[PDB]
Write a protein that binds this DNA or RNA. Structure first.
Ligand SMILES: Nc1nc2c(ncn2[C@@H]2O[C@H](COP(=O)(O)O)[C@@H](O)[C@H]2OP(=O)(O)OC[C@H]2O[C@@H](n3cnc4c(N)ncnc43)[C@H](O)[C@@H]2O)c(=O)[nH]1
Ligand SMILES: [Zn+2]
Length: 354
DNA sequence: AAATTGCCGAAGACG
DNA sequence: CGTCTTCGGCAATT
């Protein structure tokens, strides 16, 4: 049954080819515009991120994430309260001085200019049906809607790149020592970290100056390098069901969200985060054998339910940041999701039949 | 020093 | 299952 759902979720090559060709054209154009000329974002470089580029996109290739990363030397971080994930940014005749709010580099100001430039360039595209989606408060993304004629959304994510050591809130995150190992962890943490203009929500409003930590790069590496054995899912190695298990979990949540508005606060990142913990908990490739797909999915569900019940889902990189805190998601919303998942679980997943 | 190209892994296609 | 294919990521090289 699960194998047949996976067949259904699997992307078609023809769909991939048609989508990618258009998406790549638009992105390439936006990138060229940023880099030329007297622009504040002149040095941005492209990094493709998220589900599609992690090969865990399901159903249709209609969502693409891409970061435009900007190297900003000598920045100093001040943690926004005790959130671990959100920060104010300061510097130790720059183009970025336009975005300064005091000595603080404002996320809103920088994103708004970034967004303004994108809209200008999108207006000049004549051969492709593309529009800029209406702004979402808090969101770090400038979202494009493309009609290929099929609907495709492209999230362009502005990001600051810092080459320094990672903020201490991440010191006990990335607990992959018994799984991917110490050399991998050390090497990953020697890579840069990123800040995206996602504002912290403080009560009824957003703190417009705040930035948010990003490890979209690391997550991408982990998805592509996910086994304890170096040959996991390689041509001279054994196939595992780690990614398949993630697709099924993503699908379950997506179907549930499609018919229950009370689940708007839940997202695929919660699912991704839960399975990262699961991969830490069950490190052996043998406990992710394709023959044991059914029990792997069940283990994930039980773990997820327990996170729901205890209102605790630690960010994989920032362990003191609880994705399932009462502050972020209401108790009733979690209890609601708990009931739905339990139902689908005990009933052989009727919602998988659309 | 921006744009081209080579290589090959991941995974879809179909036997 | 194997073999072929395309897309993505990389960085040498001009
Ligand atoms: N990547 C990511 N996404 C996060 C997130 N916290 C919540 N979410 C949400 O999950 C979904 C992820 O999409 P995916 O393509 O990976 O399957 C989205 O619904 C995302 O919602 P969002 O409102 O927060 O973000 C919108 C837009 O911004 C990107 N984004 C959010 N946050 C980041 C970070 N930290 N780095 C890079 N990009 C980020 C989202 O991908 C989406 O494109 C989380 O921490 N990370
Ligand atoms: Zn594997």
């Amino acid at each position: 049954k699960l194998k047949k759902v996976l067949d259904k979720l699997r992307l078609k090559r023809k769909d991939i080819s048609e989508a990618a060709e258009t998406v790549n054209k638009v992105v390439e154009r936006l990138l060229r515009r940023m880099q030329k000329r007297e622009s504040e974002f002149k040095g941005v470089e492209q990094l493709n991120t998220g589900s599609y580029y992690e090969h865990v996109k399901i159903s249709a290739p209609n969502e693409f994430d891409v970061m435009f990363k900007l190297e900003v030397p000598r920045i100093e971080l001040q943690e926004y309260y005790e959130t671990g994930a959100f920060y104010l940014v300061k510097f130790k005749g720059n183009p970025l001085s336009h975005f300064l709010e005091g000595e603080v580099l404002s996320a809103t100001k920088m994103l708004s200019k970034f967004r303004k430039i994108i809209k200008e360039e999108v207006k000049e595209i004549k051969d492709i049906d593309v529009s800029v989606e209406k702004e979402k408060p808090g969101s770090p993304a400038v979202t494009l809607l493309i009609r290929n004629p099929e609907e495709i959304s492209v999230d362009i994510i502005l990001a600051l790149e810092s080459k320094g050591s990672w903020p201490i809130s991440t010191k006990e995150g990335l607990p992959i020592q018994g799984w991917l190992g110490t050399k991998v962890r050390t090497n990953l943490r020697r890579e840069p970290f990123y800040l995206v203009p996602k504002n912290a929500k403080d009560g009824n409003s957003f703190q417009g100056e705040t930035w948010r930590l990003s490890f979209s790069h690391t997550e991408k590496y982990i998805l592509n390098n996910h086994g304890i054995e170096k040959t996991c899912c390689e041509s001279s190695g054994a196939k595992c069901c780690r990614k398949e298990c993630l697709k099924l979990m993503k699908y379950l949540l997506e179907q549930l969200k499609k018919e229950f508005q009370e689940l708007d606060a839940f997202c695929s990142y919660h699912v991704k985060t839960a399975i990262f913990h699961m991969w830490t908990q069950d490190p052996q490739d043998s406990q992710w054998d394709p023959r044991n797909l059914s029990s792997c999915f069940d283990k994930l569900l039980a773990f997820f339910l327990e996170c729901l019940r205890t209102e605790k889902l630690d960010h994989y990189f920032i362990p003191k940041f609880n994705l399932f805190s009462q502050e972020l998601i209401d108790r009733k919303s979690k209890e609601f999701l708990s009931k739905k998942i339990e139902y689908e679980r005990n009933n052989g997943f009727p919602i998988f039949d659309k």
